[PDB]
Structures are given as C-alpha cells and as structure tokens.
Amino acid sequence: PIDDIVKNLLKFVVRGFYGGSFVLVLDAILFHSVLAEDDLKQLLSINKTELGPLIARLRSDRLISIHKQREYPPNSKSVERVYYYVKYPHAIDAIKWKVHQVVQRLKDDLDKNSEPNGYMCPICLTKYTQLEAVQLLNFDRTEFLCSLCDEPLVEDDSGKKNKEKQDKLNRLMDQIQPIIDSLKKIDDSRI
Template identity: 35%
Template sequence: MDLAQQLVRSVARTFFNSPSIDTRHVLIVDALIIHSALRDDDLSYLMSMNLKDLHRICAKLREERLLQVHVRPELREGQQRPTNRTYYYIDYRQAIDAIKWRVYHLDKAVQGNAKPASEKKEYFCRRCRAEWTQMEVLDKVDPVRGFICHRCDDVLVFDPEREAGGHEHSTKLNNQLRFITDTLPKLDAMVVPENTFETAHAAARPVVRDATNQAAPSIVVESIAKPTAVKGMANTGPQSIAVDITELEGPSEEEKKAEKERKEKIAQSNALPAWHLQSTVTGRGGKTQGSRG
C-alpha cells in the first residue's frame, strides 16, 4: 500500500502542478492518503474552503479516478430526519488502472507526432540548434564546407542516429514519467490490498477541530431502500398446507355418516312442539273436531 500511495501522490503532483490547474487537487489527494477517508465537511475544514468549491475540485479528481465518493444517510444530533453525507476516499486499484491508461494514451499521442524516417531531421546546427531534413538543405550547400544552415550560415552536422523532432518529445516524456513506468511493474508483481469505503473508513484518522469549529455528532441510519418488515404485520397464517387427494368417485363413508347426522338434526329442528300436537279442549293427542251447531 505504501508504494501505491507514493505513486498516487507523485501522479497528482505531476499532472495537477501547473498555473492553469488548481493545485489544491494535490492537497486533497495528500489529505485522503493521510486520513484514509474524510467526510466532505471535515475535508472542507482541513482545506479552509467552502463545500461548493470542494465538490467541484473533487469532481475533477473523481473524473480522473484518483478518488471515489460514498454517500450514506446520517442523523445529526437534534434533528428528526436523516440527511445524506458525502465521503471521499481513494480506491488504489482503480487509481493505478487509471494511471496506466493515462500514460498509455500520452505515449501514443507523442509517438503519433514523431516524423517518419523520410522526414527525419538528420542535419543540425551547433550554433543556433536548428534542425533540417536532407531535402531542406539541398538548396544551400558549400562545395568545400558542405551544407549550410539557413538560419545562421554555419556548417551543419550530419548525424543520422540523432533523435530529433517527435522522437525528442517521446524521449523527454519517457524521462519525465520514468518514476511512473518504473513503479507500475513493481505494483503488477504484488497484490494491492482492496480499499473499499468500509475498509478506508475503518482505518480513518479523525480530524482534530478547534473549539470554534466543532461538528455536530451524527449516527448512521440504515438505508430505507432495503426492504424491511412492517411492525404489526407479522405472518400468523399457516406455514404449510396439506392436500389429500383420493380417487373415490362417490362420497366416502365418513361423508355419508356426516350427511345422515346433518339430516337428522334438520328433522329434529323441524318437528312440531308437544303443545301443538295436543287438543286444547280435551288435552288428548290428535286433531280437535269442530263443534256442531
């Protein structure tokens, strides 16, 4: 991990160290390497800058894959609803792959600017450092001294092995990026530890704030996107259903018996009461005969 951190720190200083680029990119990378993972307000405190500018600079570093972003909901002390908080950290595996890709494209771009062999500048002037191709010096030659420089009239030196033009740019680039090209094979020969947000946050160094810039403590809230059980909606139904299938075409003996008992109950409930079967005159059973007039 030390070698990977050294590479990322050096790359940040190489590609973000020019007057046209905000050099605070380098300081942010250094802060993340030291602290492992930082919440945006803590990083803003260390950089003495507002969150808007911080997010803008970190967006560029994220585009170059030199840092990663993690967002999680947190509940601040004294608040009722959680808010999303942004954390920054470095995934060294992704950063190394991005560095390889960038160096490869730079090398291809410089090689594309190299002149073909037919246009190679093999004549150069020791006085003014001018370079010329063979076709360019044919019209100015001294029978005794040889080819003459068009710029200062000094004698040109012929050196076909000398790298010039685009080859010089390629050589210069290789010399400038040698520390990268020498480090990458070493990293390929070893296993770079995985550095996820959980890993980086677990190893994070706390930010020590002064008394006038204390941050309100907060706790992590589980994401509401995960499905959770609703309170009071526990499943109280049967866990399994047993189905018994028979091949009988008609009702079974149990069904016949149950049907007989059902009919007897219906008959009993439909029977007339005893007072209805007795005569209201004689008190005997049977129907009463009407009186003759």
C-alpha cells in the same frame, strides 16, 4: 504497505501532471478513511471553487471515488457524510491507460516527421503526398506541380520535427519514469 506507495504514486502524478493544490485535497482524502465533509473544508480554509473540481478530477481520475458513507442525522433526518472510497484498483486502470495512450501518440508523431514524403503547395496551402506527386509528375516538369494553383510543390515534415517528437519521447520516458516505476511496483500485487 504497498497501498501507501499507491497513494504516494498518486501524489507524484497529481503533482507532476497537475498543480500543487491537486495534492493537498489528495492528502486530505487519504488522511482519514472516513473523513467528514466539513473536516476537509476547514483544512484548506478557502472556498469550494478551488476544491470542487479537485475531488471531481480525482473521481474522474478513478483513484478515489466519493462513497455513500451513510450517517443518520440526530434531528430525525438522514443526512450522509461525504467520505471518499479511495479506488486503488481503478487508479492503475485510468492512470496507466493514459500513459499507454500518450506513448503511442508520441510514437505516431515520430514517424509522421521521420521522413518528408508528402508535399504541399504554399500558394494553395494544401498538403500533398508522393502518390499525388507521381500522378502529377511530368516528363517536362522535374518537380511536382499543383494543378489547383498551377504551382510547384514543396515538401512537408522535414527531418527536424522527427527529433522534436523523439525529444518529446525522451522527456516523456524520463518524466513518466517515476510515475510508471511507482505504478509498476503496484503491478506485483494489484491492490
């Protein structure tokens, strides 16, 4: 079943960009379709302080949403059981959206450091740019002054940092490859 790969993918990201404890609750929720609240509680045998945000993260991750699995109490009351409805369609909605968000962000970091164009005065600790440089450039001053401190300017965003963002990208592409490949394998059916 492809839905298992979705759950299998959910383990990867919840263990790749999250901790190990983030998958045991993910295991527990997906262990049973309609699982009682206490049954999950006895599995971990720890406090709710180490369990609450894990489900809240998963509900915020939109992979699984706690559903109102209504149960009729036997004591002339109505107390429901907290069974999560694993929201597979929203999983690809949320998780992939971040991947698209981070990749363009790291793409932004690439061209920011790609070539040193903006300038800066270390005395004033303020960045500048070429358009500021030219209007500040003088025939006598072959460099760029800083009228705020009356100091020469220095360049910013040297060529080294462009490699760092690319190396971030290369790690980004490699480390998200198992996530996306397991995500794009779901794109065939959208389940």
